[PDB]
Ligand binder design. Sequence first.
Ligand SMILES: *[C@@](C)(CO)[C@](*)(O)[C@H](Cc1ccccc1)NC(=O)[C@H](Cc1ccc(OC)cc1)NC(=O)[C@H](C)NC(=O)CN1CCOCC1
Ligand SMILES: *[C@@](C)(CO)[C@](*)(O)[C@H](Cc1ccccc1)NC(=O)[C@H](Cc1ccc(OC)cc1)NC(=O)[C@H](C)NC(=O)CN1CCOCC1
Ligand SMILES: *[C@@](C)(CO)[C@](*)(O)[C@H](Cc1ccccc1)NC(=O)[C@H](Cc1ccc(OC)cc1)NC(=O)[C@H](C)NC(=O)CN1CCOCC1
Ligand SMILES: *[C@@](C)(CO)[C@](*)(O)[C@H](Cc1ccccc1)NC(=O)[C@H](Cc1ccc(OC)cc1)NC(=O)[C@H](C)NC(=O)CN1CCOCC1
Ligand SMILES: [Mg+2]
Ligand SMILES: [Mg+2]
Ligand SMILES: [Mg+2]
Lengths: 204, 196, 196, 222, 195, 195, 222, 212, 233
Amino acid sequence: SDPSSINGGIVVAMTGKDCVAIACDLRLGSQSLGVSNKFEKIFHYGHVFLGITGLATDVTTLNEMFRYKTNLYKLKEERAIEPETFTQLVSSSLYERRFGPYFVGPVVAGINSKSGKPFIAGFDLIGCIDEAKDFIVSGTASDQLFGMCESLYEPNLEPEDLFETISQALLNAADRDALSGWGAVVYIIKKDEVVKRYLKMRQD
Amino acid sequence: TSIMAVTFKDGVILGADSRTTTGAYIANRVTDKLTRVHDKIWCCRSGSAADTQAIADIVQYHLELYTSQYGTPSTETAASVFKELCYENKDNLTAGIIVAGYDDKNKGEVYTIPLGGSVHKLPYAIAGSGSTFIYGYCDKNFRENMSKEETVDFIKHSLSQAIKWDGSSGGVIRMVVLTAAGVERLIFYPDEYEQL
Amino acid sequence: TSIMAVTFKDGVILGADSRTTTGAYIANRVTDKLTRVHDKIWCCRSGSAADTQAIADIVQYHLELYTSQYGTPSTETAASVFKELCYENKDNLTAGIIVAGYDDKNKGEVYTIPLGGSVHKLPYAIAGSGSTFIYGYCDKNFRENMSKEETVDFIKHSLSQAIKWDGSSGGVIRMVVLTAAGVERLIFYPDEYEQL
Amino acid sequence: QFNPYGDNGGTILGIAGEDFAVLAGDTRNITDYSINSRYEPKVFDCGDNIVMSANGFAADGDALVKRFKNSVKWYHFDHNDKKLSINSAARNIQHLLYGKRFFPYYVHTIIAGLDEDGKGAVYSFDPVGSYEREQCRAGGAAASLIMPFLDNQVNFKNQYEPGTNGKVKKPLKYLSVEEVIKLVRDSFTSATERHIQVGDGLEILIVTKDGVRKEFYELKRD
Amino acid sequence: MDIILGIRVQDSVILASSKAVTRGISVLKDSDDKTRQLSPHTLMSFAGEAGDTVQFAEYIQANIQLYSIREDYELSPQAVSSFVRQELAKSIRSRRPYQVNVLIGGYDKKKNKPELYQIDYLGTKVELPYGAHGYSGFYTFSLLDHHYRPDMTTEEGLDLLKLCVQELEKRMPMDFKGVIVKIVDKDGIRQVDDF
Amino acid sequence: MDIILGIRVQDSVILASSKAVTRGISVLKDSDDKTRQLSPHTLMSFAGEAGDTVQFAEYIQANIQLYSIREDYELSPQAVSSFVRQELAKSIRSRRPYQVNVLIGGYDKKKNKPELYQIDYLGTKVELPYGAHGYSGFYTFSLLDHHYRPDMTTEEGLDLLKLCVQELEKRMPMDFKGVIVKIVDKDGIRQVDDF
Amino acid sequence: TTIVGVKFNNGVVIAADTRSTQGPIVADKNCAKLHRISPKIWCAGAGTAADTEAVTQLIGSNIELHSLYTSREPRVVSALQMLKQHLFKYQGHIGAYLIVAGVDPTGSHLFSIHAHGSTDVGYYLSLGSGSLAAMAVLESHWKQDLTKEEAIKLASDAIQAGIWNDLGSGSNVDVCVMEIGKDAEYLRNYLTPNVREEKQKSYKFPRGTTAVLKESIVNICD
Amino acid sequence: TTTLAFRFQGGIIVAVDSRATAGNWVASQTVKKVIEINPFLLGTVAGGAADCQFWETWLGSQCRLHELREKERISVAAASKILSNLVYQYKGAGLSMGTMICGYTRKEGPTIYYVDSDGTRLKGDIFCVGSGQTFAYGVLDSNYKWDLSVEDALYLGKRSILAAAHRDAYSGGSVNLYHVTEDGWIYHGNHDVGELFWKVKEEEGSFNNVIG
Amino acid sequence: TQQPIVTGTSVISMKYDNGVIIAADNLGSYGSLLRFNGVERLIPVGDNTVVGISGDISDMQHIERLLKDLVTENAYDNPLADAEEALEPSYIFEYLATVMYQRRSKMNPLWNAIIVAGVQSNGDQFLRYVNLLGVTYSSPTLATGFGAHMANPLLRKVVDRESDIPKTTVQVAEEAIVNAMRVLYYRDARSSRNFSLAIIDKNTGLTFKKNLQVENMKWDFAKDIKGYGTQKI
Ligand SMILES: *[C@@](C)(CO)[C@](*)(O)[C@H](Cc1ccccc1)NC(=O)[C@H](Cc1ccc(OC)cc1)NC(=O)[C@H](C)NC(=O)CN1CCOCC1
Ligand SMILES: *[C@@](C)(CO)[C@](*)(O)[C@H](Cc1ccccc1)NC(=O)[C@H](Cc1ccc(OC)cc1)NC(=O)[C@H](C)NC(=O)CN1CCOCC1
Ligand SMILES: *[C@@](C)(CO)[C@](*)(O)[C@H](Cc1ccccc1)NC(=O)[C@H](Cc1ccc(OC)cc1)NC(=O)[C@H](C)NC(=O)CN1CCOCC1
Ligand SMILES: *[C@@](C)(CO)[C@](*)(O)[C@H](Cc1ccccc1)NC(=O)[C@H](Cc1ccc(OC)cc1)NC(=O)[C@H](C)NC(=O)CN1CCOCC1
Ligand SMILES: [Mg+2]
Ligand SMILES: [Mg+2]
Ligand SMILES: [Mg+2]
């Protein structure tokens, strides 16, 4: 009965040279029982990408909630929301449920359309923003991801190199965690093109 | 805390140590536990700092609003407002407050308000963790209608012992003198009182 | 309990109240808390009656057997036997014992043994529930090399206050004087000490 | 109520080569949020070319190392100065640990040395005696950070041959002592960054047929 | 309540649901239908806490039927499942949550595709080729991993389902008194009477 | 372990014992014989805590067999049951008691009478015309109160036993995988293979 | 955390470390614990990270509206009163331990607020896990009539004590100086004594190392 | 863990996974869960790793002492009972062991004995033990026949572990196969799930739930 | 299973160029009550070792007796008891460390934190810690209780690593210790002004200082502090 580790899952985000990468595993289980190997944890609202780990019902609920909020934002502002602004929106929304929180570990990733700057950010379940130059990690294998990212990462990686680093960070972290894995997805995000790759990983 | 208030010939004197503890760590060694709720109505605070502080602020607000409508309140009135808060919220409060004030009609008065929320008008009052060690001393040494210098010595010697034995008490000995003359603040440092 | 032992010029004096409580009921209002472990080595008992009693009996047995083989034991030796029992059985005992005795070489001596089983040799010692209220008074009023009459007054006034404030203490004030002259038992009734 | 256990933190790491083996461990010792020592070694030379470290609760760790060291001594007395092989040492340690199955040594134990064919060997234990020979093991507080990095860099996990359509795996090969020490130093600096109980200093014990050599490196002291 | 299974095949969705209703040391009923028809081409099986199950199932049924009358239009299986999930997602943070797990088998008439959704009492929705709630999954998932093919016929799906029920009858501790099987396809919902 | 029954009729004692051995959500075995032959004309069925049951049954068996060799004589069912009861009576006030309930069916060759004893893990012995341990009794006792007659034949006793097993299979929550039936009479112990 | 506040001649200075933790793991190696309530009222925060951020923004927002309403520059006592009344209302459940400081028309001020809503006044203060390490330094070196440059030195030295000796504190030192008659200067990363050393090896992988199953272009446009 | 062993026409198949867990932490992927007691006896292990490892190695010593004393290889029944009587002495102390003593002798033939830490000892033809036993049972039961060939039986045992390795979060790593005949046990190699899964998926056409 | 009754607070210590310094106040607290004021918590063993003990005082007095008895036992059949075969700090420590761990392993600990400071026969500085759990560690600076949180930070500014030890004189080292004792008096609610200090030098030997007091205290700034926020009077 620990909400954060019932369904399982991981998300990781990295920055490169004029690009960002966000990746996640595909597992959804009920403790020991693996149930679904298609459960994606990364969503997007315009050019802003959001990964969400933790309790799967809240992962779904928040996605639907942020879609709701970003749609009204766009109608009133007459423009797409930016990652910095969206990050604030996430923090507000999470802290609004301070004493009955969504059991999640969200991760924002994207490139600011005006300045062109790569941007990533993480949160705890209660809304505290964790901004980072290098990388953000989240999920049941966060310790593993921290260890992989902190050793493998280097600044100013090209999109094709960044893909290899983030993928190897996710895969090797996932294989040391029982509740993560069962497939993986990696988003490579450039200023005006986005490539989505499904990784081949061990299915246990 | 070690705190006390003592009536005497010319009025009343409040006394307190300056030690605030979070466990065995001293968070503040120069605390001011003597707080003004009105010109010549002060109080000593013991128990939860947050609770006594929140209460004292509300009392100060009430007495300010009282003064705007009905003029200067009595020391009894001040103690009644304290009581009302402490009694009605007894389940959520850990506050032991001594109220002391100077009227011109009633002279010096001391009211003590323990945890329960009961009121007790006394010639002098002692309270806080360190007061346990000076019940014997204070009872044997207190006299009514003391002078200012005698009362200051009585409080100084008392709080000196309370401080010496109680780990939760220490630092400087602050005092506040309430008389017709006005309001006087006194302080006494370890190098003086320790070797009494 | 309120108990104390005080060394002075001619030897040492033990003092105690006479109240035994089972909750808020006074089971015995004329208790003798001063107990003889040897001719001129006595002790004051506080804490569990059953425990202090069982200990004192064992100590009395050891010191009697000591005397049969090695002659009169020192007051330090008596305190060491008390300590040994209290320390080694600390998990199963609630005993706070003050040991007081008179040698001809060492004159008056007082050893206090709190709950832990530690030993502390002191000029005077206070213990039991009611002792908390007289730390202030006893510290301010104690002097070394007092006379018999001064020491009796010091104990009487001290235990009077301890009794006045502590509900767990009361009744008569028993005392036992240990000097070269011999052993003297004293008693003081409420009608005398209450109005000090 | 009295709690007989404590967490002294730190982290250890063992890597095996072809004709050598390393056992590394940070020199920091902690309790709660306080640093006890910036240099307190927990990787020991136990004789017969066996290095040992028992990370976790230092009292139990020191007790175990002390007993194993003594076990080596009596092995010589009772068996005509015979050299204790690494596989025999491992089994002996299992019995030491399991001996206290119902009041365990709170330590993740790792020993390193050379097997009887002269090849590098790392054995690793749980707190109650379960053991297994491996090419690679990280133990202690930051084990969860370091271990997956080792899987990737020592055993080449999840690494495929470029352009083979993820069909041919990267071939397994032994690492040089120079390459291993690089991985150790990067593992510990990375673990120091993200784990509060890891830092101060890094001490590596290298084991070859020639003997036991030591190397020390500074780590961040925050 | 205990065993509810679901298998999506080429042209239909097949839901199996145990018939036993047990309380204490007594099987009170051995012919219980643990399902409700939400719409002509949508069926929901359910399992969980006593009372909650039927109360929830009928509450959903009423809402979907109300929608159908209002719009004179059948809601898609995807839309119904999203509605159901949201209701459970509200429920879980209520004073007393519905402790009900459901499978929603439906045939989408616009896409001409069968759809199977698995939703637990927390509001955790997943679309699957085959699903199960409770301890059943621990046997059936691995069995279906092996024997399931995506292009199977309804008849092949029923044989695959028989293989599950046989395995459960062999290894499950409790007697669940067999299952009621129902098929959802382009022609609607019908019950297999002889199983 | 769960269902153990016993029925004493005119000339024999019939013991039925369930075949299921369950642990967790898995029936590990469906052909388990929950009985031991203590002597040629004495049979003991058992049920209770895992491990304890067989360990106790075999321990008793060994002791009775030791007695038989020493005296070259079979102990009476009454004597065996008294021995068993005392062992359980010691057990209950031990550091770790045997949690085992037993039925002892035997044929007394001196009296030419069948005898059925029911002993629980506390050491509570009773001679009965019919007995049961666990939840079984809650169904079978009332059923036997109605249908049992003291002068029945072994064949009539088996039909009476079939009536119990049918009722249990209908109303018991757990699948106990049928029963192994054994008959104890003047000619010794034999097993009914088709039940 | 480790946070401090020091009063000097013509104003006040506050400082903080930049480590954020979740358990023994360093979540953020360079977070901002110095918060702007108003232009010349700043706040150092320790405890529950989100609570210190949220409570300081809320009060900061209401202070701004109050400043516009009254046509006056906001006072430190107003922020102090609003914070402590808010924190008290929630009975400590909002785990914010704050050092409030600033300059206003009344003068320069330095306060501390605890999660339960109790406030203290002082010339030097320290809060957080490394407050004892910091307070040790402040008690040893603080004196009356400090200059600006002396106060910044004392403040940053007290933060360093926490950084090195407390495991709950690390990385860099942030400072904010609030002098009377001048603009408040926020010195982000005033000291950076914990720079990561050059890694022994580059772990840049050969392109094509990772095995891929599918590729697709994602549509972000309308 | 997930371990199985079943009797059939051509002897006994024994298959185990190789994962060790410390909660959700994957402790190892390369652990040995079959102990070779002698050329004719095998012991599978599930549960507490040290308990299993220590007492099964101990069992091998007791079986060696038997054949020294009795000049004859110990029976599968006697070997299993030595272990079951041992764990029964520790009953309540908290040992965690799910073992299967598999072997062949002349008097018994091929025999399997399930023994666990709460004292249960059962002879049987099919057993699956461990956290993923149910997943293994699902595949094994639905494909099992007595008349399976040595080739088909080996594969079914391998495929049943694979099934559990996939679904059970606390099982995986690799499959260790064994085949017990009248001539003794024969090792049939280590099979990494990393490669075996995709090999099986492609060739068998199964695992359609996974993104191919 | 114990609970400590009469307790002693911080014991602080550090190495310097020729030896070691150790200090501990003279208080025996009884919870919040500052019961006993004449308690010596530094106990010399021979002329080359000082054992500083915090925690339960009854257990401290037991350890005193063990050390006292250890000196006696060492003298038996030992002509070199005051020379080559004298008790070393390392011998005394390991003995205590063995006892402490054996007691915790029997779930009946000596509720203490101990620091054994001394100088070995070859001139090497010895400074090592051991507590109720049997946990042992050595460092240029060691402290127990509040000392660990407040003293160590100050003492580590003087001797931050091994190479700083030869650079530190006895004057500098003692000043740091005496300063640390003052800071502890300001901030530790179970500390006293009176304390004892011991210096074990390889040249001048054992110097045991009794009846020291914390002095040069800053309290004057207190008079300016009014109320807790919005008070002016
Ligand atoms: C002496 C120390 C003990 O009676 C005084 O009463 C003193 C009074 C005082 C202090 C500062 C300003 C004015 C008056 N009280 C304290 O120092 C007080 C001790 C105390 C805390 C909590 C209590 O129960 C609720 C009772 C007494 N210290 C504090 O309030 C400190 C600042 N905070 C904490 O210790 C944290 N507490 C908050 C309340 O809940 C428990 C944890
Ligand atoms: C005063 C009353 C309190 O400290 C004294 O210490 C007094 C000492 C005394 C009394 C008689 C003879 C010689 C010395 N102690 C008592 O009166 C004592 C109070 C006490 C009881 C139990 C305690 O914990 C074990 C601590 C203090 N009264 C008694 O022992 C009476 C006779 N018995 C009970 O109250 C029954 N107790 C037995 C012990 O377990 C709890 C219930
Ligand atoms: C030091 C680092 C304490 O270790 C500081 O107090 C620091 C303060 C800070 C950090 C960033 C920005 C501003 C201020 N505190 C933390 O980083 C804090 C540590 C902490 C965790 C849990 C606690 O128990 C309630 C108390 C303190 N870390 C966090 O708040 C992190 C980001 N979040 C969590 O750990 C998850 N929340 C969930 C809800 O309950 C509180 C913990
Ligand atoms: C699967 C993976 C279930 O986890 C298997 O049962 C596996 C079997 C196995 C057999 C031989 C060698 C390795 C692994 N079991 C484990 O990996 C086992 C799971 C388990 C942990 C704790 C238990 O509590 C009694 C029961 C089962 N994992 C371990 O034993 C791990 C490596 N060790 C510990 O957690 C150390 N603990 C064990 C209990 O005593 C305290 C220390
Ligand atoms: Mg009285
Ligand atoms: Mg630090
Ligand atoms: Mg798995």
